[PDB]
Amino acid sequence: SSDTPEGVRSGAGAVRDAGGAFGKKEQADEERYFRARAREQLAALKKHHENEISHHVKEIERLQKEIERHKQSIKKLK
Amino acid sequence: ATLKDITRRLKSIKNIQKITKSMKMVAAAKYARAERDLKPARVYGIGSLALYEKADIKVPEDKKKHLIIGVSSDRGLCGAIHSSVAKQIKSEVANLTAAGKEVKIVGVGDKIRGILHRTHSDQFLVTFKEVGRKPPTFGDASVIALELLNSGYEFDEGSIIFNRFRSVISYKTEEKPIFSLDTVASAESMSIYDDIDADVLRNYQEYSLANIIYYSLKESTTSEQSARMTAMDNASKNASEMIDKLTLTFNRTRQAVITKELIEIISGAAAL
Amino acid sequence: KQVAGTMKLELAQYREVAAFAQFGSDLDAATQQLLSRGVRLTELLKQGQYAPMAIEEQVAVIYAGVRGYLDKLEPSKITKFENAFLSHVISQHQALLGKIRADGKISEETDAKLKEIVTNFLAGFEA
Amino acid sequence: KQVAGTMKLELAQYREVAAFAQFGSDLDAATQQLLSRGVRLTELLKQGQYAPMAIEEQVAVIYAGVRGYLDKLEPSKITKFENAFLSHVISQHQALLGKIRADGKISEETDAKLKEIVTNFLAGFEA
C-alpha cells in the first residue's frame, strides 16, 4: 500500500489519536512521571530564606501576643 | 468498525512497527560492542576467580549473617532476564532461613528493587541505580565494593547471582559464592602457602570482591543486550502480521462504501 | 454543591493516572493516596434497581467518603458497609435528616454533628 | 420468669443491708458483695422516657447483670454498657432476637450462645 502515493501512509501522532491500549498507556505514563516532578520542584521551592525569616517573625508576633495575654492575667491577679 | 475506525487503528500499528525496527538496529550495535569488550574482561575475570578453585574452600557448618547481591539493569523490554534472577533470589533466601541465618540483600539495579519492594522491603542494605545506560567500567565496580564495606554491616559469607550467557540465543542465570571473611579463608589449604598474614589477606580478599562484581557486570550487560535484540524482533513480526490483516479489512470496507453510496443516488433518481 | 464539588475533582485526577495495568514504580506515598481514594469513590456510586434514594440521604453517603472516613476498609466490603450504614441513619437519627432537607444546606453546627456519627459507626461496624 | 426469679430475690437481699452502705468498708466480704451486685441491678432498671422495649431484648440486658457479667465495671459505666450492648445485638444478631420471640423459652442451645456474645463484647468495650 504505502510504496506508492495512492496507498495509505501513517503520519506523526497516530498512537494517541487511535485511543486504544497504547494510547492510554502513554497518557498515564506522562502523568505518573511528571507528578513526582511537581514534588521535587515544590519541596525545593520552600527553601527560600526570606520566607523563613518572615516566618521567623509571624511566629514571634503570635508568641508575643500570648505573652501579652499572660502579662494582663498577672496584672489582674495582682 | 466504520471506515474512520479502521484507518486510525491501521496507522497506529505502522508507527509501532517502524519504531521497533529502529530499536532493533540500535540495540544490535550495542551488542557487537559488548561482545568485543568481553574477551579482555573474560580472562581477567577468570584469573581473579582462579585462586579459589585450586583450594578446597567451603563455608563449613553455619555462619550468622549473609549477603545476596542481585545483578540486573535499569531497563525493560528484555524478556525474562529480570524475572529469572528474581526467581533465584527468592529460592535461596527461603532455603537459608531453615538454618536460622539472618540475610541482608543488595540490588545493583532499579528493577530488582522495584520487584522486591513488597515482600522484602526491610531486608535491603543499599540500592544502586543508574546502571546500564552507559557501558559498565571498573571504577563502578570499585564504587559499589567500597560502600559494601563501610556501611556498618560485618558479614561472613555470601553469594552473587547473575546471567552468564552461552550464545546469542540462550543465556543462563548462574550462582557464584563470595568468601569475604578472612577466617573462612583461613583453612587447611592456606597453611601450605607463604608468609601471608591476616593483614595481607585482609587487603587481598577485599580486592577479589571488586573483581567478582566487574566479572558480574560484564556478562549481565551482554545477556541483557542480546535479549533486547530478540524481544524487539518479535515485536515487529507480530506488528507486521497484524498489519496485513487490517489491510484486507480496510480494502473490503473501502469498496463497500463506494458501492453503498452509489445505490442511494440511483434510488434517489429512480423514485423521482 | 458543598459535597459533590470536591468529589468530581477527586475522580478527575483518578482517571488520568490509573490507565496503566503495568506499574513499575512504587509511588506509595506520592500517588497511592490519590489512586486508592478514587477506587473508594467509584464503588460509592454503584446502586441497585428500583431503589431511588432521597436527596438528604444521598449527602450522608457522599460526605462519608469525600472527607476520607472510608480509607481503611477493604475494597470488597464497601458495598456491605453502606447497606448497614443506611439502616443506622434512617432509624435513630431522623431529626438530623429533617434539618438537611428543610434548610436545604448543611451548616457548621450540622457539619461537626455529622462528623461524630460516622466515627461511632466505624468503631462499631468492624469485627 | 427464668431470669427474674434470680433477680427479685437478689434485689431483696440488698434492701436489708442497704443501711450499711453509707459508712462502710470494715464489713464482711459477703456483706460487701450484696452492696456490689445490688447496685448494678439498680442501674439496669433505669430507663428513658418514651422508649418502650421489646420483650426478648429485655431478656438480653437482664441476662447480663444477674449472671455475673457486670461486676468488674464502674457504676457510671453500667448505663453506658447497656446502650452499647443493645445496638450490637439488634443489628448483628437479629436472628437470635426472633428465636426467643417465637420459641418463648430460653433453651440450653440459646443459653450457651448468649455466653459467647456478652463475654466476646465485654472484652472490646472499655475504650
Take residue C34 and report the three cell numbers written for it. Answer: 490519590
| CA pair distance D2, D45, nearest whole angstrom | 17
DSSP C21: S
Neighbours of D1 (CB within 10 A): 5
SS3 A44: helix
| Exp. method | cryo-EM
Query: Resolution, rounded to a tenth of an Å?
Result: 6.2
Test A25 with C22 for CB contact under 8 angstroms. yes
Q: Residue C13, annotated ligand binder? A: no
- C27 chain-B contacts, CB cut-off 8 A: none
- Our measurement of the distance from residue C64's CA atom to the centroid of its chain's CA atoms, rounded to an integer in Å, reads 4
Whole-angstrom Cα distance, residue A43 to residue A37? Answer: 10
A touches which chains (3+ CB pairs under 8 A)?
A: B, C
Distance from CA of B83 to the nearest CA of C (A): 13
**DSSP designation for A4:** S
Residue C106 DSSP SS3: coil
Give me the residue label for grid cell 468498708.
D25
User: C32 in contact with D at a CB cutoff of 8 Å?
Assistant: no
Could you tell me if residue A45 is inside a domain?
yes
Q: Quote the CA–CA distance of D92 and C87 in Å, as a whole number.
A: 12
* Domain B1-25+232-272 grouped into CATH 3.30.420.40: no
C2 is in an annotated binding site: no
- Which residues neighbour B246 within 8 Å (Cβ) at sequence distance 6 or greater? B6, B9, B10, B13
Pair C78, C37: CB distance under 8 Å: no
Report the gap between the CA of B77 and the closest CA in chain C (Å).
12
Q: Is A23 on the interface with B (CB under 8 A)?
A: yes
Distance CA B10, CA C87 (A): 54
CA B115, CA B112: separation in Å to the nearest integer?
6
Q: Hey, which residues 7-66 in chain A have their CB within 8 Å of chain C?
A: 24-25, 27-29, 31-32, 35-36, 39
| Nearest residue on chain A to B8, alpha-carbon basis | A18
- CA–CA separation, B16 and B34 (whole Å): 27
CB of B95 closer than 8 Å to CB of B159? no
* Owner of C-alpha cell 472484652: D123
Rounded to an integer, what distance in angstroms lies between the CA atom of residue C69 and that of residue C60? 12
CA triple B243-B246-B248, angle to 5 deg: 115
Taking contacts as CB-CB distances below 8 angstroms, the residues of chain B near A2 are 14
Q: Which fold has domain B26-231?
A: Pyruvate Kinase; Chain: A, domain 1 (3.40.1380)
Which residues, listed in sequence order, are joined to residue B70 by a DSSP beta bridge?
A: B107, B161
- DSSP state for residue A6 in the 8-state scheme: S
Interface test with C, best of D89, D91, D93 (most C CBs within 10 A): D91
CA of B100, closest CA in chain A: separation in Å? 40
Q: d(Cα B23, Cα B231) in Å, to the nearest integer?
A: 10
Contact indicator for B128, B138 with CB cutoff of 8 Å = no
Q: In total, how many domains does chain C have?
A: 1
Nearest-neighbour CA in chain C from D91: distance (Å): 8
| Cβ separation A32–C19 shorter than 8 A | no
Instruction: Provide the chain B residues 200-259 that lie in CB contact (below 8 A) with chain A.
Output: 247, 250
Which are the contacts of B242, defined by CB distance < 8 A and separation ≥ 6? B13
Domain that holds residue D101: 1-126
Provide CB contacts within 8 A for D110, sequence distance 6+.
D96, D99, D100, D103
C23, C25, C26: best mutation site toward chain B, by most B Cβ within 10 Å? Answer: C26
Please count the CA atoms within 13 angstroms of the CA of D21 that sit on its side-chain side: 13
Closest residue in chain C to residue B121, using alpha carbons only: C26
Strand partners, B67: B104
* CB-based burial, B147-170: b 16+ in 10 Å, e otherwise: ebeeeeeebbbbbbbbbbbeeeee
Q: Structural domain tally of chain A?
A: 1
CATH number, domain containing residue D23: 1.20.150.20
Encode chain B in three state secondary structure: CCHHHHHHHHHHHHHHHHHHHHHHHHHHHHHHHHHHCCCHHHHHHHHHHHHHHCCCCCCCCCCCCCEEEECCCCCCCCCCHHHHHHHHHHHHHHHHHHHCCCCEEEECCHHHHHHCCCCCCCCEEEECCCCCCCCCCHHHHHHHHHHCCCCCCCCCCCEEEEEEECCCCCEEEEEEECCCCCCCCCCHHHHCCCCCCCCHHHHHHHHHHHHHHHHHHHHHHHHHHHHHHHHCCHHHHHHHHHHHHHHHHHHHHHHHHHHHHHHHHHHHHHCC
The neighbour count for residue C70, using CB atoms within 10 Å, is 21
